[PDB]
Design a protein around this ligand. Structure first.
Ligand SMILES: Cc1cc2nc3c(=O)[nH]c(=O)nc-3n(C[C@H](O)[C@H](O)[C@H](O)COP(=O)(O)OP(=O)(O)OC[C@H]3O[C@@H](n4cnc5c(N)ncnc54)[C@H](O)[C@@H]3O)c2cc1C
Ligand SMILES: CCCC[C@@H](O)C(=O)O
Length: 456
């Protein structure tokens, strides 16, 4: 990367906001996944959208790859600079704007996390519900198509992103639904907002997101329920969903994950396949939701509910940190995560089969999951230096993905494709789906410089 080019970057964002130092690049060459660190050639921190546009145009016209970088908490290698180039760290644009509490909407820049937004919204009676366990950039969450424990009731990012501000690869500025617009529904033209949600930085750079806000629940009750078997816990989940109980949260932990979370959070739950549950409503609604849900869990051998503001906070903090709880089982290990999502009636088959397949392997695994969506993660620890173990973990994850595809499901419910699921995506949507996706990629990024090597 030439000295003239570096000086041109500094001319846009300022000398302190460009770095070619090896340590700084290495810190931006990886995410939380096991994918090998591939450092960009430079890291740049634009201070406003005009600077994002000018950095993108400079890179694009010089043939330099662009890698958008939020908080680096992704798990599929999205920020790995597989072809080098310029990593654009977006987090210095950190302003919340256009808060419209009467319309239940707000605009956030990439440096805003969900924690920051919900802190800014306390005493408003509103909150933003989509809750990945990591303190992630909300624009990064839009880019990956994230969900969370609350999505079963309140929707994923796709459900709650109403507009996006996107710097296209050559620097043009697009407001996907129109500048300043926010509304509940539209049939106006083609829906561009949904194309950029889940695009993982391969179609453009999200520089603001317009988010749907939700009313805080009148009353909240959380609980845990221990089961004799994985089958019993997942059967309960399916029956709760088929009974249309509007649960706010329904999260599965297998016994390995329960124990890991116990050790990492000083919860003391019975070591068993467990549901973490949360219910929102009035006192009257909660009582009948609880009655109908305990009746179903009881039918499948569930324990009486162990009830949980501060004890609920500890419960969900433990759940949100499950990834780190699993990593702490074998210190020094990295890990890969699966993320399949299947039609809910097939969820018992594939979860039970996954448990059995983990047991029959010398692989260690923990299972945790947004099972209310038919989604779960298998967390597979890896010795970073054991090449034979990594091959077995990859083979396991690929076979699980293919089993989900055989059941009519998807290889990723929320994490995305990045570097790890590109072959599974080709199987999932077939040749016409792949070509159509690639045609969209090519019209927005003709030179192939917008996060190359990812998704497609
Ligand atoms: C402990 C833990 C728990 C998690 N729980 C969940 C969960 O429940 N659900 C879930 O969905 N994910 C979860 N995640 C994964 C991760 O937090 C999400 O994928 C999150 O959306 C990533 O955001 P980020 O800004 O950190 O992404 P990064 O790693 O910085 O980037 C992810 C991808 O998006 C692109 N990108 C980032 N920002 C932008 C932008 N502004 N414009 C365009 N492209 C961009 C990058 O180029 C990359 O390809 C978890 C991660 C951890 C570590
Ligand atoms: C870190 C990614 C694996 C686990 C995450 O999806 C979660 O549900 O907490």
């Amino acid at each position: 990367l030439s000295q003239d080019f570096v000086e041109a970057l500094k001319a846009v964002v300022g000398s302190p906001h460009v770095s070619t130092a090896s340590a700084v690049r290495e810190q931006h060459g990886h995410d939380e996944s096991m994918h090998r660190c591939q450092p960009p050639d430079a890291v740049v921190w634009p201070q406003n959208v005009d600077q994002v546009s000018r950095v993108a145009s400079l890179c694009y016209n010089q043939g330099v790859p662009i890698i958008p970088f939020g908080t680096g908490t992704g798990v599929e290698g999205g920020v790995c600079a597989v072809q080098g180039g310029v990593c654009i760290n977006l987090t210095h644009m950190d302003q919340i704007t256009e808060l419209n509490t009467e319309d239940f909407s707000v605009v956030v820049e990439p440096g805003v996390t969900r924690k920051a937004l919900n802190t800014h919204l306390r005493d408003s009676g509103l909150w933003f519900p989509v809750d990945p366990g990591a303190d992630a950039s909300l624009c990064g969450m839009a880019a990956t198509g994230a969900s969370g424990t609350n999505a079963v009731r309140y929707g994923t990012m796709r459900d709650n992103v109403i507009n996006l501000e996107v710097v296209l690869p050559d620097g043009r500025l697009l407001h996907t639904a129109g500048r300043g617009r926010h509304y509940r529904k539209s049939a106006a033209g083609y829906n561009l907002t949904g194309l950029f949600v889940g695009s993982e930085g391969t179609l453009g750079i999200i520089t603001s997101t317009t988010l749907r806000l939700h009313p805080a629940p009148e009353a909240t009750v959380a609980a845990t329920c221990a089961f004799p078997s994985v089958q019993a816990a997942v059967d309960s989940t399916v029956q709760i969903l088929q009974a249309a109980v509007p649960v706010a949260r329904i999260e599965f932990l297998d016994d390995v994950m329960m124990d890991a979370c116990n050790r990492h959070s000083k919860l003391n739950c019975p070591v068993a396949p467990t549901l973490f549950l949360e219910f929102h409503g009035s006192q009257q609604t909660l009582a009948e939701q609880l009655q109908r849900t305990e009746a179903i869990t009881q039918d499948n051998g569930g324990s009486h509910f162990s009830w949980a503001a501060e004890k609920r906070n500890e419960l969900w903090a433990a759940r949100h940190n499950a990834w780190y709880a699993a990593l702490a089982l074998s210190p020094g290990s990295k890990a890969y995560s699966t993320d399949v999502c299947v039609p809910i009636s097939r969820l018992p088959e594939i979860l039970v089969e996954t448990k059995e397949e983990i047991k029959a392997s010398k692989l260690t695994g923990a299972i945790v999951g947004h099972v209310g969506d038919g989604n779960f993660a298998c967390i597979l620890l890896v010795d970073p230096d054991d090449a034979e173990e990594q091959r077995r973990v990859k083979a396991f994850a690929e076979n699980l993905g293919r089993r989900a595809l055989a059941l009519g499901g998807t290889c990723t419910g929320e994490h995305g494709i990045g570097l790890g699921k590109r072959q599974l995506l080709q199987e999932e949507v077939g040749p016409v789906g792949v070509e159509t996706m690639r045609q969209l990629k090519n019209t927005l990024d003709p030179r192939g410089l917008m996060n190359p090597g990812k998704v497609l």
